[PDB]
Amino acid sequence: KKKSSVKAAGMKSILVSENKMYITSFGKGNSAVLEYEVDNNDYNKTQLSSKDNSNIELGDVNEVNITFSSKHGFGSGVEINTSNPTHRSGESSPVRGDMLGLKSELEKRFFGKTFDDNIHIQLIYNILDIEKILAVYVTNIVYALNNMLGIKSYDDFMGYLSARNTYEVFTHPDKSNLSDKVKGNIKKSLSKFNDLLKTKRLGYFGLEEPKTKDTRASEAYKKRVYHMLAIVGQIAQCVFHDKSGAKRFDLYSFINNIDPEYRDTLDYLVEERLKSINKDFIEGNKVNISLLIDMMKGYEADDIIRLYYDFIVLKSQKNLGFSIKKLREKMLEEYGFRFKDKQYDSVRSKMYKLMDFLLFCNYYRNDVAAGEALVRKLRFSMTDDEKEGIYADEAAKLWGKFRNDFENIADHMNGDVIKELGKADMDFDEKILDSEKKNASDLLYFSKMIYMLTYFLDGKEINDLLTTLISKFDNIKEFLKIMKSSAVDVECELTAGYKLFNDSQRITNELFIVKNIASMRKPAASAKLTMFRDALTILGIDDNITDDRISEILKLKEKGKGIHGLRNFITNNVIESSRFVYLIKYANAQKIREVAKNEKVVMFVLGGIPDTQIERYYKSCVEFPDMNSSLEAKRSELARMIKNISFDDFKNVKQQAKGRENVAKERAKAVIGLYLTVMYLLVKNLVNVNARYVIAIHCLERDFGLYKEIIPELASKNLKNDYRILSQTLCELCDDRNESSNLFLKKNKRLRKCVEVDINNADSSMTRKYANCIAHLTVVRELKEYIGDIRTVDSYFSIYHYVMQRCITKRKIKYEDDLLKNHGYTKDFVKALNSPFGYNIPRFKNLSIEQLFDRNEYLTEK
Amino acid sequence: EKKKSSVKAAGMKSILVSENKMYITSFGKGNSAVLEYEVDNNDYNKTQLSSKDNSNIELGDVNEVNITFSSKHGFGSGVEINTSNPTHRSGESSPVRGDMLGLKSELEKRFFGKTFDDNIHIQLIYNILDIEKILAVYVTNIVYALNNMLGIKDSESYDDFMGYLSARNTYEVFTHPDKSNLSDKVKGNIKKSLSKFNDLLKTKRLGYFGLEEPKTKDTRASEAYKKRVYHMLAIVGQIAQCVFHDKSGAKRFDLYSFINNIDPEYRDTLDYLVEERLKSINKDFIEGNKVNISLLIDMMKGYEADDIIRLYYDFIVLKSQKNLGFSIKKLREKMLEEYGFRFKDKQYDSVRSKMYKLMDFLLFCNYYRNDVAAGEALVRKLRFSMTDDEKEGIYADEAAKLWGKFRNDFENIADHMNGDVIKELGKADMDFDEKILDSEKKNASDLLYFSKMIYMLTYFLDGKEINDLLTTLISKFDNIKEFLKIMKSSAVDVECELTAGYKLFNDSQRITNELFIVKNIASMRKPAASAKLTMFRDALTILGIDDNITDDRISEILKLKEKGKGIHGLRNFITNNVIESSRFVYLIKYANAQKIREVAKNEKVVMFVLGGIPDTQIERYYKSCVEFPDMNSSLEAKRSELARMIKNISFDDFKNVKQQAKGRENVAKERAKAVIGLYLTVMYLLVKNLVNVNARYVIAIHCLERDFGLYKEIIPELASKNLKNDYRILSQTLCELCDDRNESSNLFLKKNKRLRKCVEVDINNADSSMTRKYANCIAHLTVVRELKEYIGDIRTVDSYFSIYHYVMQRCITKRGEEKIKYEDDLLKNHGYTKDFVKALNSPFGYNIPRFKNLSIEQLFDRNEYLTEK
RNA sequence: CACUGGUGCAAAUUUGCACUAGUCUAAAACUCCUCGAUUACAUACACAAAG
RNA sequence: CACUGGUGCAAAUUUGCACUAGUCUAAAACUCCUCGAUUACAUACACAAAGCA
Ligand SMILES: [Mg+2]
Ligand SMILES: [Mg+2]
């Protein structure tokens, strides 16, 4: 695969105004450098960049081509030719519209008027991306909270919550002046809130009820939990339509408009995390700081301390424009293969932090130019191999300069030294970090709200949500900046709902810090009896087991020291496992254990895992390994082990193992790690496939509201009655009269009629069931029921479609007969169910055809 | 930037002018001339002499004022180039241009016995004049080095030792003058030289020239050794007699003939020196190069092993890779700079010369054998190139193509470049017969005596001196052979019979090839000699030791008397890092160890030398030499630290060095080697630059004596004049003739009245006494000898030229006579006087470019002020 | 920041500038080989050890 | 193995190919930050211990 020569050469964007064109080049990060202004009529050019700032030299410009060359050596200064974007056939305007044709309507909603430019729409599409990611996360969180109850038919208790109602009104609905019917809705949802608290399952999210029976602390805890759930419910109302087809418009303003008590909760949660990190930070990191201060002979100790705090909390090394971790991995891969020995496994995080910090200070302070040089090389790179080679070449240069330092760090990486350093006094003052320290008061409420949301998410979910949000705010701030520049000077005033986007630069910086602090391991909640039941059940246990029996086996009631080995082993390897929490939150322990019985599903997951990893698992988990075993034999053994696992296998585990006792203990931990990882891989992949469908539904509801204003035919229609209405209406018009604003259907007749055939196969009832199943994660909920039937498991996509197809046809549909017959998903059934997304051709083809669905599959394809 | 002549770039080598014809030549391979056209100077009719295949240029219109031509090979896509017709000159009746000096007719008579109405013979003669200029520099340096060795006291007798030697006397006459039939005065003069010769042998300093006396004291071996030394010294004295005049203004004319006319014992010595060198290279060459030959045979799949071995012998001894028309070293350097940065890693430092030989050998076979056409194309692009940046671009583009071809081979070479692999290849039994090289080996009998004489001269020289003398000689011989070949061709057919003393030049083609081999073998590291106590005293003294130290103390400190195992670490460390350093040998040869150590204390002088060194190199020196180095230090702070280290160095700092160091002790030993290396380099840079400055003045004196002798034949007013009586006589006489008689012989003076009047003011500012003292100081390297005496007095050390002139001016003004008028300003200023330089250089005024270049600091060095204008 | 030829502009006293050449100038003609040069260089890896 | 521009080919037509772009397509603009991912991740070496309605 080759990257764009225009992107590589340094050309970031060509913005089109009414009679002018603005050309930008890449600045640091996502910064745009205004280079030239070009008149669209006589092609006159004005350079806007300074000679020092300029990255590209503009050559001839004509109606069809733009010519430029890099000022920094890309392709040795060779001329590059790109299309003049104003040049399009059968289009009068130089500025193009969106494929959906909603550009004018969207500009009105966001800026209050239409514009003869393509800049505002680009910013608006970025905001739409934020809503798409929020819709996926709100759906997942709402489902997990419902699953925590054990719903059984979907009464969504999140639905009756309102961030508008204070905790007092929520606890006392008949103690206010609200609609009689409203009072009733609160009661129903207040019951479920008390039910959820009863389960103790909120402990999984780090939300632990108070140890004391203090009514004050208890109500304080309940009030914070109520605010979090109400805020989640409020976000869901903003990105999903109700039965009336209406959505709240205060997604970006509500956190600052609602009662201030909610803000106190957001402040409390952030303060709790920031206060612990900020308290005696030097004392808390004295080991690594002391080693760094001795090693970094060129630096002042207070400067090293300030840099280390940034490295931990601000993570400035993640804003260099290159991966420091990738450089460290390359160094160890080719030179430091010694540091990869199992001997350093116990100290691997600490060692990597020291190595990463030395590399960080090298490019952030000592050699900034080298960092900028490396970014330019990576930007100029045209293939993945070239990029890997650039990291490899730089690793060689880094190894020559730090190999002695890395070896010194390796020498200090041992319990003796680390324990000694921990005891050692650090003669340092607390107030050195007074300037660098970040506090809750320094963050906007929207950023604090995103931090709060992270409580319900695992590490990957936090990374995916925060990285997407940070990228969108970063793009939105750049667009506002270009528009407000003297050279461009376009109006761009956001309407009342979107005033938040004026602080996009601050939000991008704050969200970055939130991603860092949210990724840190939360203080563990005390393991509850319910958690122990989930842990025993996932492993395999008697369906009839009682709470009294579980407590006796784990000696939960008994008081004493060293008699809780089994309880400790289950807590350390199961309850505290991120994979286990993900499985409990989105699935059910008993159903997961049953699904694990299926070798076909298990083998499919095992097949995905790399061969060397499978070999490591085989060596670690099998008591009597067959050395001459084939890779398929190793996968089969691992699969059989997962099939026969049970709680009974770990009843005699010795937490305090000594000598060869350790061998059995280590084997038991490896087996549980492998079992939890495989089940987690299956459930996570299914939730991820489902998220693509959540996006389509969110877009369809969103697009319906936008088209409705510009399509008179849709005026009486309700989406909930028939999800196929947007694609159906748009299709007919195309065939009807060159009348359509949707470029996808209008431009492609074959793609327009293709969707029609699919729309006809569908029905209002089926599509409604599909929309409900997508939002309710029914495919994960009913995985055990139909998963066993599947004849062959070859993709998550095929697994998801078969289960959904069984849930939809359950008690007719035309495809039901071939479905139960074939024991495989029906492709045409998929196109039919996806018919409501026909209007968006790329989304419809990506979600309908397996080969196009996953960006990571079929890399070896031309 | 600087642009090359488009005429040269397009392919026109020269326009030879005869009485009625013009011959146009283009560039063939290397220095070869391709006769392209004959043009009649009257009707401008043209005849093509070149074949269609050989032709490199197409001649367009030719008229009285201009010549139009274009390249047949794509220069400027066939653009018309316009050059002046050389026969068109204002105020000149003849189509044939004269030399600036007006000595063309006299020079033609000296070399050919008659004058010629052509510009060809003179061009050949100017090449011969170039050979004499370079020889004048080297003999002056060798004679000074021999005098320095004697620890001379600069008495009346500088010339006694070398001056009284005669190549016409055998070793027997020189050693027993009383038994000769020579005159009583001559016998007396021989005894003064014999006494100095015995003094030279007594010093035991000849080991510095690789002329170590035999270990055994048998008379036969000792007499054979002394005889060889006498032959070498007599030959050097003979050469000095040929390029410099005596008190009477007389010089020998047998420079090119004497080696073949003197006693055969002299030729035996030349054969012995060459044979010793060639026999060691020739004996078991395959076994001696088995590591590289074994690796190359495994790698070079398309070549037979015997072919690789023959090519490898050529690569080491013949160096055919240095005759390709482009630099293999430059191509290899570019490849490493851009794509092979891993190869530049410090892990390869110990095997770098071997690794480079392997890489360079692959590039050599690629252009010499596999892709000859690629090499020819590369030469054409380089000839066509108009600027240095264009040339660098051509090398860079070719390097990119070579990297694609040779990346796997270069990686394979690097994989083998380690001690374990080299050690194993070293132990392997190589089944290749030495007889494979029977037809390729060069022997002493294959070389002319003149070539052997040049080899002999190399004993007295360092590597840079050998490269400078040999490259200059090879280039002049290459030019002379081309002019002779052109003249003897059927198309030109001009007589060109050299007179008897110059018949050697008939063999110029053979001499050019032989000197090339001499350059290769002479640049070969000589076998380490046995360090004498004298050398240990020089090494300890240069490092810094108390002046009263005794021979016994030195023998005691280094355990020279003691016999044992592992007790000689300090002696070995001094030998490996000081005695064996060519920088140290150069310093001892041209200066004294004690004076150099004293000069090293002048931080201003050290800072000036350190200032010339590139910043990346200073950073390497700071890292390697300073025990506790500040990371934050500025480049000027780093230079200052290095200068302070040089000022503070002493022998005492190294007395606890352990040769067999380990761990942290080893780091200290490496630091000690680094400090000594930096110290020797800085001092060497200072002394070498001053000797090089002095060489320019030596050339001026050589030219003045040569020019005075030639002008004496055509200027009646110079007939009763003795040059040594007043060095200003040629400049004064030529200027005076121009002003009144309108003398027209010297074009530099006749043409530029303003410059002639300026020279007259400078002659008037000087006098016979000062110019004679200046001539003596230049010939005796007085500036280098007296450097410690006056260098401390300089206020600002700005350049080598200003250092040389300040010291020179202090030497001229020193009392021992009326005060020179420039003395008061010189003493007050603490810097050289520009007017004083012009007055001292006034004897060279007759040659305006030389006078300006030697007088004006800005014009002196071709490598300085590249940006300025 | 040269010297000399050729060829132009311009100044204006006997000037300069520009372009362009020159193996028949200056350590000095293209490409090499060199030198500047530190980065040395060098038929034998480097150390160590010894003649 | 997409979608849409632009630019070429075409002999084959509602078409096809190649090259090439695209933040105004799709989870989808460079470099990051991420994800794929197993290799988890994580202010405090690891272990043990502390962890019931
Ligand atoms: Mg010459
Ligand atoms: Mg987008």
Numbering used by the authors:
A (entry chain C): 50 to 201, 205 to 863, 872 to 922
B (entry chain A): 49 to 864, 870 to 922
Paper text:
Cas13d is a class 2 type VI-D CRISPR-Cas RNA-guided RNase. Cas13 family is the only family of class 2 Cas enzymes known to exclusively target single-stranded RNA. Analogously to the other members of the Cas13 superfamily, Cas13d also contains two R-X4-H HEPN motifs, but bears little overall similarity to the amino acid sequences of Cas13a and Cas13b. Owing to its biochemical properties, especially small size, lack of constraints on the target flanking sequences, and highly efficient and specific target RNA cleavage, Cas13d is a promising candidate for RNA engineering and editing.
In order to understand the structural basis of pre-crRNA processing and mature crRNA recognition by Cas13d, we solved the crystal structure of the uncultured Ruminococcus sp. Cas13d (UrCas13d, also known as RspCas13d)-crRNA complex at 2.15 Å resolution using the single-wavelength anomalous diffraction method. The binary complex was obtained by the selenomethionine (SeMet)-derived UrCas13d (R288A/R823A) mutant co-expressed with CRISPR RNA in vivo. The SeMet-labeled structure was subsequently used as a model to solve the crystal structure of the unlabeled UrCas13d (R288A/R823A) binary complex at 1.86 Å resolution using the molecular replacement method. In line with the previous studies, the mature crRNA containing a 30-nt repeat region was determined in the high-resolution UrCas13d binary complexes. Although the conventional bilobed architecture consisting of a recognition (REC) lobe and a nuclease (NUC) lobe is still discernible in UrCas13d, its compact structure blurs this bilobed notion to certain extent. The REC lobe consists of the N-terminal domain (NTD) and Helical-1 domain. The NUC lobe consists of two HEPN domains (HEPN-1 and HEPN-2) and Helical-2 domain. The mature crRNA is sandwiched within a positively charged channel formed by the REC and NUC lobes.
